[model samples]
Target chain A: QAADKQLFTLVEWAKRIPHFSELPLDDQVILLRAGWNELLIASFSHRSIAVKDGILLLHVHRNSAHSAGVGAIFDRVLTELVSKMRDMQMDKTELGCLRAIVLFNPDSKGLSNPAEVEALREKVYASLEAYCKHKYPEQPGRFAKLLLRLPALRSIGLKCLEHLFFFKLIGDTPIDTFLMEMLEAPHQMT
Target chain B: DPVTNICQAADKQLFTLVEWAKRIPHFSELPLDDQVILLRAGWNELLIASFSHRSIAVKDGILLATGLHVHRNSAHSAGVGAIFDRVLTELVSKMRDMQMDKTELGCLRAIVLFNPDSKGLSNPAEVEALREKVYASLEAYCKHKYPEQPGRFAKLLLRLPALRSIGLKCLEHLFFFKLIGDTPIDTFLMEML
Candidate 1:
């Protein structure tokens, strides 16, 4: 239930992003595929008790207790992201801007307009910098710290997210298919 | 009618934001000079956030901090105002759809107010912490209050950048320098602060 709500909110918000509508239909789909996992992970910062492993662990149900290595790494990295965001006391604005920056990634492979996506990425980060500077004038290098979370977030890949959250939720359906259906939206039979 | 007159109105509202900032927790504790810089940097964003909160109920148009309403039909009376009004209207509409209440609104505003990266802050860490406090409160509030809407907190926070983008557009498009021929916002905000 929680994941579903976030997916809808993110999808609608993606359509509303400034240049998102101008991009070709296929590009919009590709961008979503590229960044959906990070987008989902970023949303966790808003959840309470992200500190709880059980709460986050339940999503990673696919991992057999036997192969503890993969599960442990997922648990560790996801926990680290939650801890980092909590440490920063990452506010809604910062979290929101972070998702936008991650979503509009210029380096997302197979883009017709990487430059355009790149520009949107710059604009979003610039806004984040200005926001952090103005809002946190007491913390001079805070902007970089926020940007750094991007790498850490990507540390847990899409497969990790799918195996953890979506795979079990949708029973063998591909995340790309699920995302396309979710974003196109205008669903059942899942 | 004149750009000078409109800018004067804008100045009055900007000062109102400064007054509000004075009351924010730990804001006045910053060096007085740093306070001025922080306010100047986020002047437009602060004003827009306030305007969005105050006018949350008005659906068809935007009610400016100056008390002027830009209705859909009258939006074109000034291109800059028209552009800002539409963009702001979309934002307010989305915020309304989210059912953003007063408490959340205050938190979002404060989150914008306590920015750590404001140029030349004598103490960025403290400001950053202050912001963290506000957002932490907001995150807890969202968890306890809107349990069904797990994404509510991020959605609300995410709108901040959009608001900032709109504000910058306001600064760029509502060019007082071009209209009046030479006063930079730096000097102008200093005079007001």
Candidate 2:
């Protein structure tokens, strides 16, 4: 239930990001779908998760035997990721820029306007770099350290994330369907 | 002056080429060994194509990275240099005739660099996928950006094999045999990598 709640909230959170709404609706959906998992994890970096004894407690205790095995793997993934974020002490400004950067992925396969998308990513990239240089002068490499985390975050298999997180909540309904409905019907929620 | 310093100029150009490759999406994701293989397989085509783009403004033969203009008559060996000059000048003329922009040039460079058919790749499938993406990007860019030039995309793609042909011919007669003696081209490229 909490996973669904957070996931739904991300759909809305993305709409408010600068230049996001300016994109074509089709492009918007494509970007959202491509980076949703990455965004969810980035948000998790800021908020809390239920991890105990190096296991993801929420899914393991509730799911069946087969799920427990997957849960253990996910547990390590999330646990290590969370600890990395904790070490860096990622602040709201940095996290905000990271979310925007991940959302404006130039590499999303089917983008109609990838050149424009690339331009937008460069804009946010410059902002983050400048912000890090001015605000975190002590950690000279903070900007790169933050950006490097993105590729690792994406390498986490999409199916693994969907099977573990979404399949349980939105059973029998395609995840993209849920995401599209949320994106298209912004009026109902607000 | 132009031919004497051309080797050092080429050494400098490879650095820029590799750095540009690093920026292409999915280019860096390939294994380290595979990366070298792809560059090794395609660097000559990339170099010639780059020359085409850089020397489009030159009225005579192609321009090297060192700002030196290479004319057909300038080369010591008329047989090899004349062939290179004519073919390269033809390429530059075609590219100019098309009015190839920077974005188009970049897409062409990438499409040539990620040769799926390149022999000895550990993962040709991945390289093929990357090339397809670049190819599609060029298609889309040409379609949207050059609405007037309906055949622009196909024309751009057709030039690719010509670039390869020039690269092969250039290797056989130019660069290595005269400049670096009997040292193989692969070893020479690997040295820079």
Candidate 3:
């Protein structure tokens, strides 16, 4: 329950960024749902009954023929976020950190996948390490935590992970929760 | 003198019969910048090489209308060649100087190969042309220098999988991704010959 509140707070905070706020409402929802889904999958694994049941409900409420399709809306939002990040010169370290956080969190709805979430966590850590070495050589150890504190950086990280989660789910083979936790275990526990 | 220096360095590093010819000898006597334009004519010569190979095909009369000849070939080869010659030549050399590895090379190659030009080509001659040119240039050098029945240049090209890999790496670089537009580097590489 506390995790759910934290996730909601993060999403709302992300939406307040200039890039996020400017996005259309449909795109905003896509970003929120995808980001939420990825984070939950990483933390809990998509294969868990909790994740599956949640996703089934989301599909039922959000899935409609008349409105903009979920997948398309998700893609459009992600594309916009990517474009904005590129324009803003968002660093890879921040992006990676956000990706790790997003992929590790369990979703309220059951759409998370552990395998894919784990993969993203690994990639994000590697990217973050490299970025820190280059940009904060003086205090590399502090860089990752500092990146987490930056709103813009966090926003991009959250948004991109969301997109990646949606991509995996839509493509099929829902992710596992244990795998997601395993990849993220190194950072949060320490 | 910089042109001469670049030529000398190129001679030591690159494999080819690179020459600096001018419409007039006086052009050669001009300032180094002027000399650069002539030497840079290698870019045009590269274009000619593609045309000679019938590798670069154009439609909508764009090249012809612009007074450039339009031969039939693939856009992949021509575009990659253009970028490889213009952009990657300097970029890769810098990476080599920095002692970067083959993974970077592979990534750059993948990025360059996968991204398509805004204007799509009808075929894949450009990539083939680049492959052939690199092979032929290396081959000609080896055969002339080590010809007691010399090994093929194709062998040399394959040996530098690092070079190809770096090409893909550069494609992933944020600068390359942004400057060149938002085309996926993986897609561009998959399309290459």
**Which candidate wins on lDDT?**
2
Worst 10 residues of 3 chain B by lDDT: B184-193
Task: State the lDDT of candidate 2 residue by residue for B111-184, as single tens digits.
Answer: 77886545578897687568767766777788798887655665565455356546666766764334332223
State the TM-score, rounded to 2 decimals, of chain A in model 1. Answer: 0.71
Per-residue alpha-carbon lDDT of model 3 for B24-135, expressed as tens digits? 2232333333233223222222322222222223322113112343222232324334444433333333333434333323322222232223123333344345434444
All models, RMSD in angstroms: 18.2, 18.8, 24.4
- The residue-by-residue lDDT of candidate 1 on B1-193, one tens digit each, is 3447557766776667778888788888888888888888778677677666667767665666545554444323465655445455446765776788988988888877776656578887787678778876887899799987655665566566456546666676763223232223324666546
Using DockQ as the measure, name the better of candidate 1 and candidate 2.
1
Candidate achieving the largest TM-score: 1
Q: How displaced is residue A81 in candidate 2, in Å?
A: 46
Worst 10 residues of 1 chain B by lDDT: B175-184
Top DockQ model: 1
Q: Residue A128, candidate 3: how far off, in angstroms?
A: 28
Stretches off by above 4 angstroms in model 3 are: A1-155, A158-190, B1-120, B125-134, B173-193
lDDT of each: 0.66, 0.67, 0.36
What proportion of the real contacts between chains A and B does each prediction keep? Answer: 0.00, 0.00, 0.00
